[PDB]
Amino acid sequence: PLIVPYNLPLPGGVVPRMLITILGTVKPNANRIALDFQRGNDVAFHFNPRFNENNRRVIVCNTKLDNNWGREERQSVFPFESGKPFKIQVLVEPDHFKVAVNDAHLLQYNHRVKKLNEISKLGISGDIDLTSASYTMI
Ligand SMILES: COc1c(F)c(F)c(C(=O)N[C@H]2[C@@H](O)[C@@H](CO)O[C@@H](S[C@@H]3O[C@H](CO)[C@H](O)[C@H](NC(=O)c4c(F)c(F)c(OC)c(F)c4F)[C@H]3O)[C@@H]2O)c(F)c1F
């Protein structure tokens, strides 16, 4: 397994047709997972499954600019389960990040950070065993 938190450099940032795949297993009794696509200190795309927010499961997505979080986008479809292996695929498209979990479309997140070629790091954190994190162009 890879160390968590894990930093995956994205050389030259992201670009449409780049597919980022995260394989891992959720820990028992998980509380949260986070993916943070970073442009320097900014977070262009934060993808945050929360396993117990007031006894509900939700995926929170947002952007952090100058240390301020913006308006959240919430998705109640929640494909993760404690103890189970998952695959997260993030496909960069011209207008949004497109996320599929376990081969099923989950959500899209419109680009708020415009300089895609400066989104040069992905941090992977939270209550997972991380197997692999990689990218390819499709
Ligand atoms: C792996 O471990 C970590 C992790 F996974 C993380 F995500 C984080 C992290 O930075 N999390 C922050 C990040 O996820 C951020 C994204 O917006 O949200 C905060 S918590 C956040 O705190 C805000 C106030 O400071 C608000 O309370 C946020 N809630 C809402 O905007 C919100 C709400 F409160 C209503 F009641 C709504 O009901 C309709 C609603 F829609 C809301 F969006 C509430 O979601 C989290 O603390 C972290 F630090 C970790 F260490």
What this model shows, in words?
- There is one protein chain.
- This protein has no helices and twelve strands.
- The chain has 138 residues and is mainly beta.
- It has strands at residues 6-9, 18-26, 33-39, 42-53, 56-65, 68-69, 73-75, 85-92, 96-101, 104-110, 121-126, 128-137.
- The strands form two sheets. Strands 1, 3, 4, 5, 6, 7 and 11 form a seven-stranded antiparallel sheet that branches. Strands 10-9-8-2-12 form a five-stranded antiparallel sheet, with no helix packed on it.
- It binds ligand 6E1.
- Ligand 6E1 binds next to strand 4, strand 5 and strand 11.
SSE diagram, text form:
Elements: E1 6-9, E2 18-26, E3 33-39, E4 42-53, E5 56-65, E6 68-69, E7 73-75, E8 85-92, E9 96-101, E10 104-110, E11 121-126, E12 128-137
Antiparallel strand pairs: 1-11, 2-8, 2-12, 3-4, 3-11, 4-5, 5-6, 5-7, 8-9, 9-10
